[PDB]
Design a protein around this ligand. Structure first.
Ligand code: 3QP
Ligand code: 3QP
Ligand code: CL
Ligand code: CL
Lengths: 396, 396
């Protein structure tokens, strides 16, 4: 049965973990997968998470299955983060949320729900985007088409190209938008641009799917949701796949949410019964631990205050690392102007290193980035900054 | 986009939770979903699990992503439970295991792996079986066909009918076998029958997929795996989807495993790279908490001893409840011979109640079973036994 199966290529992002682990050299520097590291180059459990976990250990009295859509309080806290307290979507009961195993899980649930229950055949994704978007949608049987997004010469959102790419999208196609911290470019629409896209997609009949994996890492929780809220105000229907992996440092507990929005509560409840059927046929019901930590934190004033300050701390450290990286490249002799990096949002720097420069950085210098040239700025520290920049300068 | 979506039917098993929750009557009795309850009608966290969780709280220093296939020690402990310490499959490195979100997740991963990477088009499932089997395989695009299994008149495995149903299976079809505690019938092949099926499926070219959600609930961990081991000894290739939800009481943490076996290590490693690609496109990587609890327990002599005795305790309580149920039906005037129930394996009693009797038990008596007539014996207690049996007698 299996004699003839050809090997899959290693994953361009997660596959780096294997190579990095196998590299026995001591000065290695990991700027690959999008995890946060603190000033010591560690990814600790957040203190608010440990506190919540201690509370759960003391107070949980069963592991009985959650509902297919997960913890109700988790869904309500998620909708409030996405749409804002007092949102009409919430008041009108127009949104249903399933807790999912990670943002990836939420994208797969959305895709299977769309493929089985609507006329959707194609999803439009930005070029460039996270490489696993294509894989997830294709796995559900949906075609993926790309829309232009990035002007590499000026390091800006090429809004005219984006518009004119999307003119090929038909009514009823899905268009995927990253909510904030575009991966990999770090370049987000301004609010006015978000508003322009909202009106365009209503006019053109696109179904918006927002990916929201980095809420809080661009400017802050509420500001980062402004683009999604501009869409929510204009559309009867949309879907949001959101993750708490990064903003709670809960990567391996798989905590995400798929939120379905429709014109009214009768419609969303009917549609949502098919999303639950899709989940049941996939992983049955979602893992409680990480979601219960998030719900415990978000629903407790003290834990929430601790957590929101930890999120602010991560965002500000990454911003300090952006400045230091730009400053140190200059000092180590780069010559090129890299100041555009300071303006990028989120964990990454997309600096125009070629695939061969990235390969050379790994093989010769033990510095690990993704082949697209995406670098995890959140993996930089004052101690590894000098060697990292010396290596980059050496490959330029 | 969603105006026209027709509502999904509620799930025949998980949907009971909603109805039971909404039923405001005080004497309700829950014999529906397959969770264990102790003598107080509660589903507590196992003591070995709490201990492991305390250890994790004290010792975990990151939530950084696991590999796509999860915790290595978890995979190794899983293969040892399935195949036995010293198994040739293990020595020859012929098996790869991915940790998955539950047994359901492992079945979906197997199905997507098969659909995308082999010529498999059809999976054969016993009539009756767990209703979500059909849903999972169909969601991956595979057809499901049924094979005869149960002689309801004599309450036995109708082995001749099973054989003659399966003559219609082609070489290269998958045949799904429940490892032990067949759900819903509680009727398992004897070892000699397992051995006969192993030789038959090799001869006929069927790919065996074992579902193993109840290891330890029939007779014990090792005895319950004898059928799978009879298959492993005869086949070059098979897949096992196994769950730790029930035998660790970890239902909501979603702890399962998909184990792929091929003729040699080169083949299984190549095949497994495509199973990992399928996982990446689904939920990316699996939830650490429940799996890390299982690995922590299975890899520690003291915790393992505690856990194995807790598993024995659950199995023996269910066996005491089977006897008490049969005895009490007799005392409350059933008249029918129900002694066949004592011999059934696992959590359930499949007693021949009709769908209408089950509906009447819910509506009129607040007693909740599944429409197929499956009753969760693990939900019976000395205190709820009298009322439960009075209700059943009243509907006969
Ligand atoms: C745009 C986007 C959407 C969805 C995900 C996955 O989040 P999850 O862990 O499933 O909650 C990521 C995260 N990307 C990371 C890590 C990875 O590739 O798995 C990265 O790009 O390095 C992402 O960047
Ligand atoms: C044969 C079989 C295979 C797979 C599963 C799901 O296990 P998981 O929770 O995903 O690890 C169950 C469990 N069945 C239960 C609970 C349910 O239906 O979800 C039941 O039949 O009541 C099962 O009975
Ligand atoms: Cl509902
Ligand atoms: Cl490997």
């Amino acid at each position: 049965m299996f004699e003839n199966i050809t090997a899959a290529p290693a994953d361009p992002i997660l596959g780096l973990a294997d190579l990095f682990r196998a590299d026995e050299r001591p000065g290695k520097i990991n700027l690959g997968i999008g995890v946060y590291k603190d000033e010591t180059g560690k990814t600790p459990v957040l203190t608010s998470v440990k506190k919540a976990e201690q509370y759960l250990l003391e107070n949980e009295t069963t592991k009985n299955y959650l509902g297919i859509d997960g913890i109700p309080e988790f869904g309500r806290c998620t909708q409030e983060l996405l749409f804002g307290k007092g949102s009409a979507l919430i008041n009108d009961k127009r949104a249903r949320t399933a807790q999912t195993p990670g943002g990836t899980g939420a994208l797969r649930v959305a895709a299977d729900f769309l493929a089985k229950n609507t006329s959707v055949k194609r999803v439009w994704v930005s070029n460039p985007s996270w490489p696993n978007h294509k894989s997830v949608f294709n796995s559900a049987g949906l075609e993926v088409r790309e829309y232009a997004y990035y002007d590499a010469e000026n390091h800006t959102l090429d809004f005219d190209a984006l518009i004119n790419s999307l003119n090929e999208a038909q009514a009823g196609d899905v268009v995927l938008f990253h909510g904030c911290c575009h991966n990999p470019t770090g370049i987000d629409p301004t609010l006015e641009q978000w508003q322009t896209l909202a009106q365009l997609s209503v006019e053109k009949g696109w179904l918006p799917l927002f990916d929201f994996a980095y809420q809080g890492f661009a400017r802050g929780l509420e500001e980062d949701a402004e683009g999604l809220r501009a869409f929510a105000a204009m559309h009867k229907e949309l879907i949001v796949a959101s993750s708490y992996s990064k903003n709670f440092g809960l990567y391996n507990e798989r905590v995400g949410a798929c939120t379905l929005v429709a014109a009214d509560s009768e419609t969303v409840d009917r549609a949502f019964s098919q999303m639950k059927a899709a989940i049941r046929a996939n992983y049955s019901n979602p893992p409680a631990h990480g979601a219960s930590v998030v719900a415990t934190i978000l629903s407790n004033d003290a834990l929430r205050a601790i957590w929101e300050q930890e999120l602010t701390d991560m965002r500000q450290r990454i911003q300090r690392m952006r400045q230091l990286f730009v400053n140190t490249l200059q000092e180590k002799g780069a010559n090129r102007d890299f100041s555009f990096i300071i303006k990028q949002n989120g964990m990454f720097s997309f600096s125009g290193l070629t695939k061969e420069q990235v390969l050379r950085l790994r093989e010769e210098f033990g510095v690990y980035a993704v082949a697209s040239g995406r670098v995890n700025v959140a993996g930089m520290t004052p101690d590894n900054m000098a060697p990292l920049c010396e290596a980059i300068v050496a490959v330029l």
